[PDB]
Amino acid sequence: EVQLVQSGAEVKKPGESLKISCKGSGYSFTNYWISWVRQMPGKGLEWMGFIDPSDSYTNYAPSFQGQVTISADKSISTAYLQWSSLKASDTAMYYCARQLYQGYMDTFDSWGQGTLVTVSSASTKGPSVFPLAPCSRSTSESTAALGCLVKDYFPEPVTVSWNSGALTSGVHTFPAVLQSSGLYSLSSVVTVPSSSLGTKTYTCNVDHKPSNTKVDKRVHHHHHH
Amino acid sequence: DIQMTQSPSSLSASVGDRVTITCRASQSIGLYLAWYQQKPGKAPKLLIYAASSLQSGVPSRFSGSGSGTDFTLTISSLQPEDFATYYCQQGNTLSYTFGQGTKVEIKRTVAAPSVFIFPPSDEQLKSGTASVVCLLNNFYPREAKVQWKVDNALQSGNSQESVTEQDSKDSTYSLSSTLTLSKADYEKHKVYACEVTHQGLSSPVTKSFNRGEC
Ligand SMILES: [Zn+2]
Ligand SMILES: [Zn+2]
Ligand SMILES: [Zn+2]
Known about the structure:
The structure holds two protein chains of two kinds. Chain A is mainly β. Chain A has strands spanning 3-6, 10-12, 18-25, 34-39, 45-52, 57-60, 69-73, 78-83, 92-102, 105-111, 115-119, 128-132, 143-153, 159-162, 171-173, 177-178, 184-193, 203-208, 213-218. In chain A, a hairpin with a 4-residue loop joins strand 18 (203-208) and strand 19. Chain B is mainly beta. Chain B has helices spanning 122-126, 183-188; strands spanning 4-7, 10-13, 19-25, 33-38, 45-49, 53-54, 62-67, 70-75, 85-90, 97-98, 102-106, 114-118, 129-139, 145-150, 153-154, 159-163, 173-182, 191-197, 205-210. The interface between A and B is large, with 51 and 53 residues. One zinc ion binds at residues 52, 54-55, 57 of chain A. One zinc ion binds next to loops of chain A.
């Protein structure tokens, strides 16, 4: 089967160079043009440009001309996208796609799995984890919400579990937000029986691979401050 | 270059529905329009090319029509695997351009949010910052208004929020909003409140606490 496999996610600082790659297989690499497409976080698809691997002819969208370089190594059926100097604004998912001319137009019939590129002046940092618990006398209803606030980490992602994975029902772990500090923050919450609040313990388990850290936090509200 | 405009930007539909999404080009592109499907975290998939030609392996419930500047993608008898974002793409001339996407979401009945407020932890306060969190749990539709009030004054510019994707079991959303203050500012005020407006609520719901009585 036709297959494009892209290189792994990259976390970079502004000013650094970066070359990412796209390896084709299951077809004659040299016979099909390859396009690169950008997708910024939460946004749509943007065509960047293409290369004809056979003669190395390239073409770029106006906004990308001079900004990036597309190349190919037919020897190894590989296409490349590269920047001399990254900016935070280059943060996005990047796809390579095979072009198949059908119905008298170029179509992108096969896509790589995407390469996430994060560009930030931030440095790797593990999260702080704080409990989310209701004020002592505010739980009126039969069900209550508890949670953990996972703050000030970089880069994404963290993974959050509850009670070592024993608790999965009613858990919502929210998308991270990027703070003005350049660090991420997210919350994970769970709804539980109001009656269990005095009986059962609830602990969030937060793993952050990039910093090699793991933080457990028992959720409660103290009776003095 | 040629601008592609899709409508609507999002829509909610039920399994079995006939769904129609439109694409408008800023100038004629003849028949040279393709449609793509994309799910979160995943690569796009080609569905239709040359306006109405079905890509090999794509289910025939997908069909495309149109010519010139106005095109439509139709999904007959929408299936559970079809909730996703759809993009048009013109291939008339370079530079190739895509529409901004249409997200097809799951229709269900109105559900009011359950609202919770959480005061900052003592551990956080020790380090100089106070995060106050408001949770809106399991609501539908997605549109919701959260307003923070501190000593009964509306807050602006000091909160961030985010929203889950639709729940796999009940198709609802949840939302978390965080109000961030310095410890010094937190300690000077008394009343912390989040006020929620949503179609499922007859009037706004407010959850609050008093610092020092919490
Ligand atoms: Zn050529
Ligand atoms: Zn005040
Ligand atoms: Zn207290």
